[PDB]
Nucleic acid binder design. Structure first.
Ligand SMILES: [Mg+2]
Ligand SMILES: [Mg+2]
Lengths: 110, 110
DNA sequence: CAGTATCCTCGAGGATACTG
DNA sequence: CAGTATCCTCGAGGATACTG
């Protein structure tokens, strides 16, 4: 696994290691609330990300068994990304963080 | 605000900005589940952290309005750290990450 | 379309000595 | 006790170019 080397003082740090990476929560959000997307579709939904980084974050999310990757032997190539059942289990946490973020922004910019 | 210089694609990225720092979730966990802790008491609870990093994360959490800092004019000095109501509202997310983390920790090592 | 291949920056985090 | 003052490490993320 990715986290075989790491030493944690809490299982929460492990969750953070799965979703903490720079763009991962944005990726997981789009896949969990819009279903399956091909690579170039994710890249258009996330314009500021570079190609090497988008694939890297997707690969780490796949090694963590959070994201499923499906390659089809077609021309032009076709690769689909979607959430695994464990990825789906991460959605309640992501939603909680979305609502907490909205509530936090209210109080700091008034 | 700490976040005046930062740009986000989601409100979840804001929550992550608050709690994602290297030792922050641990510190919030101790404060929310064991109450107030003095500086050296926290340093004892987290033996690996250095004093410079501990004060840094506490200052950021304070500046994010998550942690309260109380200084007493006594000898020896006495500084108490605790959760503000916004910090306490973060605990459900931390507990949800704790439970998700232990379930993940058991599944991948199967 | 959906990837690979190289090289590099920068700032979060750290070791240690000192101190009001 | 609760921190500062110096100097330093290191790797995630990014710039930039190529491709089956
Ligand atoms: Mg006490
Ligand atoms: Mg080259």
């Amino acid at each position: 696994s990715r986290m075989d080397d790491k030493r944690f003082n809490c299982e929460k740090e492990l969750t953070l290691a799965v979703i903490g990476g720079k763009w991962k929560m944005l990726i997981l959000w789009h896949l969990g609330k819009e279903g399956t997307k091909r690579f170039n579709e994710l890249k258009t939904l996330i314009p500021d990300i570079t190609q090497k980084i988008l694939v890297n974050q997707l690969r780490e999310l796949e090694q963590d068994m959070i994201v499923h990757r499906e390659v089809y032997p077609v021309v032009p190539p076709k690769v689909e990304y979607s959430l695994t059942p464990h990825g789906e289990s991460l959605m309640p946490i992501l939603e909680a963080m979305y609502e907490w973020g909205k509530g936090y922004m209210e109080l700091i910019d008034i």
